[PDB]
């Protein structure tokens, strides 16, 4: 006698109830920094202050 | 060297056990023999049951198994004689014989006089020659219809008589269950001490008079 009744989780994920109770996605990536020394570099230095 | 917490334990391998080890690799075509030479048995004894001479109604002893019933060794010599079958004729028609058994109650004695009529009736008995029967020998229609039996003959199953749902009377409810178990324990043990002092107190009244 079955543990879970609908194994079909391609289709359970996209029926009216599950897609009206989850926050929106974040599909953007944020790649790493190279710290331009603001004692040297101008507009880098005009951004701080 | 025991490490730490851990149960102490005594092995008996101090002898030379290996020289006496038993294994059962035989186990499968040792069964398949029994069953074969089992299967030989009753082709030899054709319309006689392979279930053999019939076993009596017998209890199991002691206070544990004394609620139970089982098959026994043989019918007592006051169960055969009352029914109307002799001890050396009973062997010659599937009825068990044992020279030792007892009759102490009449509640397991009436159960073994009726057992032998059930049987005597439902038996089918063949003629000495096929071409000339006699008097007690059965007809040639049963004997046509008659045939072998399989498994114990009239096998004893576990029995108990039922009881109803009853309105309790006003003196059942006025009966102690624990205090009547304790005043039967008290008077069984102390009756030896009781009777010698009802004697020694009644001994002194006889002496001071005379």
């Amino acid at each position: 006698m079955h543990k879970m009744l609908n194994t079909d989780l391609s289709r359970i994920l996209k029926s009216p109830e599950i897609q009206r109770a989850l926050r929106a996605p974040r599909k953007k990536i944020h790649r790493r920094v190279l710290k331009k020394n603001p004692l040297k570099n101008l507009r880098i230095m005009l951004k701080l202050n | 060297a025991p490490s730490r917490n851990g149960m102490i334990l005594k092995p008996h391998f101090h002898k030379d056990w290996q020289r006496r080890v038993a294994t059962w690799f035989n186990q499968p075509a040792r069964k398949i023999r029994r069953r074969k030479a089992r299967q030989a048995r009753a082709r030899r004894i054709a319309p006689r049951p392979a279930a053999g001479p019939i076993r009596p109604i017998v209890r199991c002893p002691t206070v544990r198994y004394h609620t139970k019933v089982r098959a026994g060794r043989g019918f007592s010599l006051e169960e055969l004689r009352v029914a109307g079958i002799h001890k050396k004729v009973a062997r010659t028609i599937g009825i068990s014989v044992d020279p030792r058994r007892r009759n102490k109650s009449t509640e397991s004695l009436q159960a073994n006089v009726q057992r032998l009529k059930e049987y005597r009736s439902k038996l089918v008995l063949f003629p000495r020659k096929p071409s000339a029967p006699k008097k007690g020998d059965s007809s040639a229609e049963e004997l046509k219809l008659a045939t072998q039996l399989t498994g114990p003959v009239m096998p004893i199953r576990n029995v108990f008589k039922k009881e109803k749902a009853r309105v309790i009377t006003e003196e059942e409810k006025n009966f102690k269950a624990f205090a009547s178990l304790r005043m039967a324990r008290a008077n069984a043990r102390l009756f030896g001490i009781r009777a010698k002092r009802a004697k020694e107190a009644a001994e002194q009244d006889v002496e001071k008079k005379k």
């Binding site: - | 060297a1 025991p2 730490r4 206070v63 544990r64 108990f160 749902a165 009853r166 009966f175 269950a177």
Partner: protein
């Protein structure tokens, strides 16, 4: 299996998990339970208090069927019937009571544990402990004995 065990991860290492200094050598403490009042003292007396000594009387040819006493509590004393002696008994007007025999379900002495489901009950039992009497009587039921 002989592959998933420790001894494959050790073909290559020298001391094989029994030592550089003090090796695997035959029997360091004495075989079996040795040293019971000497050099394996502490242990014995700190996870097996009471191994060493006598107590009580000795009964010789002890036959254990005479000592034979099974047991059945209250909470679950209705566990010897079908689900038919209780639902029709609760339906009654004149006030009947079914007969639970305990000798029929391998029970000799009747014990006094939990609650009771409160509806009339006659109770056969070989031994009544003192709470099996007072729980069944206060609700309302007889206490018949058997041998």
């Amino acid at each position: 299996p002989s592959r998933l065990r420790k001894t494959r991860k050790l073909r290559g290492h020298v001391s094989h998990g029994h030592g550089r200094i003090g090796k695997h050598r035959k029997h360091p403490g004495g075989r079996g339970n040795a040293g019971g009042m000497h050099h394996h003292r502490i242990n014995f007396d700190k996870y097996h208090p009471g191994y060493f000594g006598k107590v009580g009387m000795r009964h010789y040819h002890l036959k254990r069927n005479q000592s034979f006493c099974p047991t059945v509590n209250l909470d679950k004393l209705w566990t010897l019937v079908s689900e038919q002696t209780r639902v029709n008994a609760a339906k009654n007007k004149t006030g009947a009571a079914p007969i639970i025999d305990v000798v029929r379900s391998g029970y000799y002495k009747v014990l006094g544990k939990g609650k009771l489901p409160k509806q009339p009950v006659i109770v056969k039992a070989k031994f009544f402990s003192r709470r099996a009497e007072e729980k069944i009587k206060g609700v309302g039921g007889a206490c018949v004995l058997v041998a």
